[PDB]
Amino acid sequence: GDLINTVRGPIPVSEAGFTLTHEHICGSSAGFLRAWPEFFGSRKALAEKAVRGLRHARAAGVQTIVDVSTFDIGRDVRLLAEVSRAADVHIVAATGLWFDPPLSMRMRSVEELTQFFLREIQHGIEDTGIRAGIIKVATTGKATPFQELVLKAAARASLATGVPVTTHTSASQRDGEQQAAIFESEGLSPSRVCIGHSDDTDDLSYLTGLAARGYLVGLDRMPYSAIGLEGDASALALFGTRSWQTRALLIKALIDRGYKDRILVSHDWLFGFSSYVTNIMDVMDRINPDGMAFVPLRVIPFLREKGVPPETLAGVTVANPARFLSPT
Ligand SMILES: CCOP(=O)(O)OCC
Ligand SMILES: [Co+2]
Ligand SMILES: [Fe+2]
């Protein structure tokens, strides 16, 4: 009975089960869902859509998602409690900062960031009492000077509390390596850290370099492909031109090289998206109507059929998430 915090309260680690470890109920901005609920039709329409989508993943075998929306992704922890109950799926919430932090965060020192993250982990997000169970952090290239601070503060808050840290990278620019240097300079154990979006590159030199050091490797955009959408300039920059299979192969690729224990797999999916072009979410829904059941329905059986054994895939979808989220 080691235990982790979800938006409905504590749970036993061993009940986390099949866990998608990089997901979003809604990709937004701080204060936005409350200032402009209609952007999304309504708070009510959004919740109902999350709920339908999560019951879908849940039918498919998913029991937990980790919602890595930070303050600046507009994390609404009330909405997460409310879809979590309605759909009967555990949702682990996040602290940390993504790459859209407002001036109130950007003016802060490493010491004050660390107080902010610890607050959300140890006391509760906002006035709610709901505790973040993962720390989210981000670079898009060389870490900006403020990003260095967030990363060091992320590492301190993790050593204090034992909550894992997880990251956004621009994977083509091999951010994970800097990211790891910064965390390591703070004494953080690589097995407390997941380097995310790593399925955005096919650079296995890069990926096995991280895995070999003990980092978890987040293969977390499985359904993101813009094949057949070549005249959709915003779809392209976001989805890329590699297929879902090409991504799913990375998983086998690491398993064949002995790195089964260092993989986490997810969709980086959402049910609403205000922080990009208008209607991106219709686009997304056409390219992947399965939303967050895409991994269990498409990716696992594809792995099974390329000869990956079931015990191995269990270790990836259950054991690794469990090892990772377990406060250490
Ligand atoms: C919250 C949305 O931000 P992102 O995860 O970087 O975007 C990928 C959909
Ligand atoms: Co991201
Ligand atoms: Fe994300």
The string of DSSP letters for 107-153 reads T--HHHHHHHHHIIIII-STTS-PPP-EEEEE-SSSPPHHHHHHHHH
Q: How many CA atoms lie within 13 A of 230 on its CB side?
A: 3
Tell me, what amino acid is at 97? L
Helix (H/G/I), strand (E/B), else coil: 78: helix
Max CA pair span of the chain: 52
Going by alpha carbons, the residue nearest to atom 6 of ligand 1 is 168
- The annotation status of 268 as a binding-site residue, yes or no, is yes
CB 179 within 8 A of CB 159: no
Ligand 1 atom nearest to 270, measured from its CA: 9
Query: And the tokens for 20?
Result: 């998608």
- The annotation status of 56 as a binding-site residue, yes or no, is no
Class of domain 1-328: alpha beta
CB count within 10 Å of CB 286 equals 10
Tell me, what amino acid is at 228? G
Q: Which of 211, 236, 216 has the alpha carbon at shortest distance from 226? A: 236
For residue 183, give every residue at least 6 positions away whose Cβ sits within 8 Å of its Cβ, in sequence order, or none. Answer: 151, 154, 155, 165, 190, 193
Instruction: Return the DSSP state at 315.
Output: I
Tell me, what amino acid is at 223? P
DSSP strand E in the chain: where? 3-6, 9-12, 19-23, 26-27, 64-67, 90-92, 94-96, 134-138, 165-168, 193-195, 216-219, 263-265, 272-273
Going by alpha carbons, the residue nearest to atom 8 of ligand 1 is 268
Pairing, β 134-138 against β 94-96: parallel
Q: Is 260 in the pocket of ligand 1 (CB under 6 A)?
A: no
Q: What are the b/e assignments for 241-265, b being 16+ CB within 10 Å?
A: ebebeebbbbbbbbbeeebbbbbbb
17: left (phi over 0), alpha (psi -120 to 50) or beta: left
Q: Is 268 in the pocket of ligand 1 (CB under 6 A)?
A: yes
Experimental determination approach used: X-ray
Helix (H/G/I), strand (E/B), else coil: 44: helix
Q: Which of 182, 224, 216, 211 has the alpha carbon at shortest distance from 196? A: 216
- The annotation status of 197 as a binding-site residue, yes or no, is yes
User: Cβ-count burial of 110 within 10 angstroms (0-12 exposed, 13-18 middle, 19+ buried)?
Assistant: middle
Q: Is 101 in the pocket of ligand 1 (CB under 6 A)?
A: no
Dihedral angle over CA of 15, 21, 24, 27, nearest 10: 150
Phi, psi of 312 (to 5 degrees): -60, -40
Helix (H/G/I), strand (E/B), else coil: 197: coil
- The annotation status of 136 as a binding-site residue, yes or no, is yes
